[PDB]
Amino acid sequence: ANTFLVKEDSKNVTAYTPFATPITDSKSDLVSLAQLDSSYQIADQTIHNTNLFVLFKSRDVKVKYESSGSNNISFDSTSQGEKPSYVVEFTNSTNIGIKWTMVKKYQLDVPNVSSDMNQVLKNLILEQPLTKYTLNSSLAKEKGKTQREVHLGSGQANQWTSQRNQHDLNNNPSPNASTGFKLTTGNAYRKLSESWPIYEPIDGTKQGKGKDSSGWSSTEENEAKNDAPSVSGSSGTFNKYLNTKQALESIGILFDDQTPRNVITQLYYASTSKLAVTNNHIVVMGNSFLPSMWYWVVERSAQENASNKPTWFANTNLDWGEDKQKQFVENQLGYKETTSTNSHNFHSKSFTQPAYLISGIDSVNDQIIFSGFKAGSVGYDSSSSSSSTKDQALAWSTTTSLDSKTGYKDLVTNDTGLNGPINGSFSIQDTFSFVVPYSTTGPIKTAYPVKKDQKSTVKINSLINATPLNSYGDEGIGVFDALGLNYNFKSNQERLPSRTDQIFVYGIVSPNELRSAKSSADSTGSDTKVNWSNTQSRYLPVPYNYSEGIIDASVTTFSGLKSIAPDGFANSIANFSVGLKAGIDPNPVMSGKKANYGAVVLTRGGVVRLNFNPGNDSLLSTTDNNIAPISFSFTPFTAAESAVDLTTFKEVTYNQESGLWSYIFDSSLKPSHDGKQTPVTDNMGFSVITVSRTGIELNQDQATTTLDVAPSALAVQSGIQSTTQTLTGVLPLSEEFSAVIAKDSDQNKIDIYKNNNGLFEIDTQLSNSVATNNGGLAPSYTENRVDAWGKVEFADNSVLQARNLVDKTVDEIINTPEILNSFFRFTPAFEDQKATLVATKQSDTSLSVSPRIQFLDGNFYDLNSTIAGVPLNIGFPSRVFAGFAAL
Numbered sequence: 017a018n019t020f021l022v023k024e025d026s027k028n029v030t031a032y033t034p035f036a037t038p039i040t041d042s043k044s045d046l047v048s049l050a051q052l053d054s055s056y057q058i059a060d061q062t063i064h065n066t067n068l069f070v071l072f073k074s075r076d077v078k079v080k081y082e083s084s085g086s087n088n089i090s091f092d093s094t095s096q097g098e099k100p101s102y103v104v105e106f107t108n109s110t111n112i113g114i115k116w117t118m119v120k121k122y123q124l125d126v127p128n129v130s131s132d133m134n135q136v137l138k139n140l141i142l143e144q145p146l147t148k149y150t151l152n153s154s155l156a157k158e159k160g161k162t163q164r165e166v167h168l169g170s171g172q173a174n175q176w177t178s179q180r181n182q183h184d185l186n187n188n189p190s191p192n193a194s195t196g197f198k199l200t201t202g203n204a205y206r207k208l209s210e211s212w213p214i215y216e217p218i219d220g221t222k223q224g225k226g227k228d229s230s231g232w233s234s235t236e237e238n239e240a241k242n243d244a245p246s247v248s249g250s251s252g253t254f255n256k257y258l259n260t261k262q263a264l265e266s267i268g269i270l271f272d273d274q275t276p277r278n279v280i281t282q283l284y285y286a287s288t289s290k291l292a293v294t295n296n297h298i299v300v301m302g303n304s305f306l307p308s309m310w311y312w313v314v315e316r317s318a319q320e321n322a323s324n325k326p327t328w329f330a331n332t333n334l335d336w337g338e339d340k341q342k343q344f345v346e347n348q349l350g351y352k353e354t355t356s357t358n359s360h361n362f363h364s365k366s367f368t369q370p371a372y373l374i375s376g377i378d379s380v381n382d383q384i385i386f387s388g389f390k391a392g393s394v395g396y397d398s399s400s401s402s403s404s405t406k407d408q409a410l411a412w413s414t415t416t417s418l419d420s421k422t423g424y425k426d427l428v429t430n431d432t433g434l435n436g437p438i439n440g441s442f443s444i445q446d447t448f449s450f451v452v453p454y455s456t457t458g459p460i461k462t463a464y465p466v467k468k469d470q471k472s473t474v475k476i477n478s479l480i481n482a483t484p485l486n487s488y489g490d491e492g493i494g495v496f497d498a499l500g501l502n503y504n505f506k507s508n509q510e511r512l513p514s515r516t517d518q519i520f521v522y523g524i525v526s527p528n529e530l531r532s533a534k535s536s537a538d539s540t541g542s543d544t545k546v547n548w549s550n551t552q553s554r555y556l557p558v559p560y561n562y563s564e565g566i567i568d569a570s571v572t573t574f575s576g577l578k579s580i581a582p583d584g585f586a587n588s589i590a591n592f593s594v595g596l597k598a599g600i601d602p603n604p605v606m607s608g609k610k611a612n613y614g615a616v617v618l619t620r621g622g623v624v625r626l627n628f629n630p631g632n633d634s635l636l637s638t639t640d641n642n643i644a645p646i647s648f649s650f651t652p653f654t655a656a657e658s659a660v661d662l663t664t665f666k667e668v669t670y671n672q673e674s675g676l677w678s679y680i681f682d683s684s685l686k687p688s689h690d691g692k693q694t695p696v697t698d699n700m701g702f703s704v705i706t707v708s709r710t711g712i713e714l715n716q717d718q719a720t721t722t723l724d725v726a727p728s729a730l731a732v733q734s735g736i737q738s739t740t741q742t743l744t745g746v747l748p749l750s751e752e753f754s755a756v757i758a759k760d761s762d763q764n765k766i767d768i769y770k771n772n773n774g775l776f777e778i779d780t781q782l783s784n785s786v787a788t789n790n791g792g793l794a795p796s797y798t799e800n801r802v803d804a805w806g807k808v809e810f811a812d813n814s815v816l817q818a819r820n821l822v823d824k825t826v827d828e829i830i831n832t833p834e835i836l837n838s839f840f841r842f843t844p845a846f847e848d849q850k851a852t853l854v855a856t857k858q859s860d861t862s863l864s865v866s867p868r869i870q871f872l873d874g875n876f877y878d879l880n881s882t883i884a885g886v887p888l889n890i891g892f893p894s895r896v897f898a899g900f901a902a903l
């Protein structure tokens with residue numbers, strides 16, 4: 017398709033030509049055309065074999081979780097909120113223009129809930145989502161019991177050597193290791209049936225109520241409402257809470273008046289955000305804002321008015337790399353036994369990581385690509401009565417030890433922190449570290465923080481965090497875990513990874529793999545599992561230089577950590593990802609081998625490159641355990657790219673000619689108000705980041721058959737940007753030129769940006785030239801000027817006598833391209849703009865010529881050029897030459 021589609025708002029999509037003009041009548045209310053009510057908006061859209069596929073979701077959607085009976089999750093039929101999300105396939109029915117017409121429609125239903133899932137969901141509790149305005153101090157939580165307060169109790173410290181063997185903690189040198197963090201304060205946790213508040217606390221160490229629903233509505237809510245009142249078209253203090261209602265509206269939180277709808281409705285709304293199409297499937301996943309606990313796998317072959325069922329992430333096993341890497345995640349999901357009446361959590365019911373913050377989803381060839389962060393999910397003790405971990409989340413640093421052999425496989429499979437706590441704070445001679453030094457009796461036993469005694473008489477249930485952090489523990493290991501600051505003291509000095517905090521996840525899912533996820537989703541009775549083995553994990557912290565004044569040699573923790581983050585987030589500890597796209601590399605490969613492809617995704621302070629073997633559509637790898645999985649490469653941002661507000665991400669396109677990704681950011685996406693209820697005024701403008709591959713690419717030649725280096729990428733603030741204008745769209749015409757449509761007032765203006773040695777700058781003269789289009793689809797040809805089409809000077813008729821061409825014939829001259837090229841002088845409008853003449857016998861004696869001329873997009877245009885089958889009628893000149901012979 018030689019046209020470009022452009023979402024002009026929540027409902028309408030319009031086709032643009034490469035001249036930044038709308039195709040007449042192509043502007044389409046797709047919501048209306050999908051026969052859906054006006055509460056529906058477009059969430060994502062895609063081209064697949066020339067048809068348009070659109071994901072719609074409703075602002076009216078309301079969802080219930082009744083934790084008793086069956087079919088536990090369902091839409092609120094009463095009022096009207098049975099407004100499920102739909103995927104729709106449109107085709108173009110005209111040959112002249114764009115008339116879209118609906119072909120298939122798919123309702124995305126609410127998940128089945130096996131009896132066995134529902135016991136976890138009874139007591140599942142979820143953190144309020146991270147916003148733009150959430151502070152490191154907001155996220156901090158009160159430090160929980162030490163490893164020996166839980167096991168031994170209130171007797172003494174100096175039993176720890178004699179007493180640890182009976183609690184299966186042999187040789188563990190960490191009685192003073194945290195078992196996580198208190199839920200009596202901090203960010204709010206809520207069950208699927210309750211609601212999150214609009215207030216976040218500035219110091220969650222002191223001002224949350226945490227999971228104490230009761231306490232909130234009884235005590236703390238009127239206090240926070242006193243401190244942080246909603247603007248009205250009072251203004252108050254903000255000593256203790258931010259009011260983030262508007263920043264919540266911003267990331268897709270839904271409301272009745274000033275109250276957010278229940279968690280289950282926010283999970284559903286946020287879970288229908290991204291789509292991707294194959295010949296056989298539509299897959300639908302969630303946004304990078306909320307954790308998503310399920311995805312949909314629609315079979316294109318599905319019947320009308322059917323009910324496409326989502327698959328639980330809890331039912332979907334990934335390869336985390338090595339096997340120990342997966343066990344780290346599951347061991348911290350909750351307490352496991354076959355002694356515990358009603359101690360029901362994801363780990364005890366034999367489920368796996370239940371929640372991802374999805375970066376996005378795409379299809380290449382016939383494969384779904386995805387990436388994301390593991391959303392923190394752990395045990396919390398929910399008992400009453402006098403249980404010592406009561407009201408406490410059970411979490412700990414799983415960060416490698418210092419003495420761990422350097423070499424990737426050896427680092428991520430180090431046994432340090434596998435079964436319970438060991439990390440905290442240590443000093444050897446006068447060298448300090450948060451990480452355990454070691455890793456003669458036997459082994460160094462880690463064990464889950466539940467006193468063997470009270471084992472049947474404890475209540476460990478599941479929680480899900482709003483970020484990629486397991487432990488909010490207001491201690492030093494927390495900051496080094498999240499920021500990437502645990503290093504060993506050896507020859508090379510190597511960064512020691514977490515296998516629980518800040519874990520990035522990516523993969524390629526095959527059609528058979530999809531067919532199981534659907535099979536899991538329709539299973540009646542018991543949970544059916546699904547293996548995605550084309551997948552990997554990676555420790556991916558936020559860059560430390562997004563913070564200040566951190567101490568190493570009072571040691572800095574989350575509650576005191578100064579953020580200087582420039583990427584539109586107040587916090588400097590939680591990582592974020594957005595806009596995963598794939599593309600096929602257009603740079604041919606040694607034949608005998610299939611097109612190379614990859615994907616990129618932005619993360620805090622860097623681009624990441626996903627690498628694949630197109631042979632067997634797998635992840636790239638190398639024989640060597642030592643070196644780090646070559647499926648992943650991270651390239652840090654420079655100051656210019658770090659300045660971009662990631663929370664304003666709008667769109668990402670690939671272009672197979674350039675082999676370049678364009679990330680568009682639109683500042684109109686900022687919330688109306690700050691957490692201090694101050695109006696936001698830097699909401700004008702936009703920014704484009706350009707990504708391109710680097711490194712030696714697979715199968716360029718005999719030597720590159722294999723690789724022990726990961727192909728990387730590079731993000732560049734391209735130079736296309738504005739703080740003044742309202743974006744409408746960015747047409748990436750070619751490697752050399754981009755077109756921005758925008759308003760300054762209320763009428764659209766076209767700017768052309770030109771690529772100068774890899775930096776794009778506005779060409780005021782090309783812009784005014786392309787804009788001069790007389791209300792037509794394409795820019796005017798102008799006889800005495802060098803406008804968008806350049807300037808064409810025809811030879812005088814007397815060039816024929818001059819060059820003895822009178823002796824040649826129309827029919828001869830027409831099959832001599834290089835002779836009629838000498839019938840004009842072209843002055844181009846941009847470097848290496850080309851132009852040919854096209855002849856046409858008019859008589860026995862005469863021909864005429866009309867030029868074929870390159871535009872910004874690389875393509876030639878002439879008198880018969882069409883876009884979407886609609887004649888452009890560009891108005892190039894013509895010329896008759898006469899006095900040729902008839903031999």
Ligand SMILES: [K+]
Binds near residue numbers: 338
């Ligand atoms: K593996």
Ligand SMILES: [K+]
Binds near residue numbers: 752771772773
């Ligand atoms: K250039």
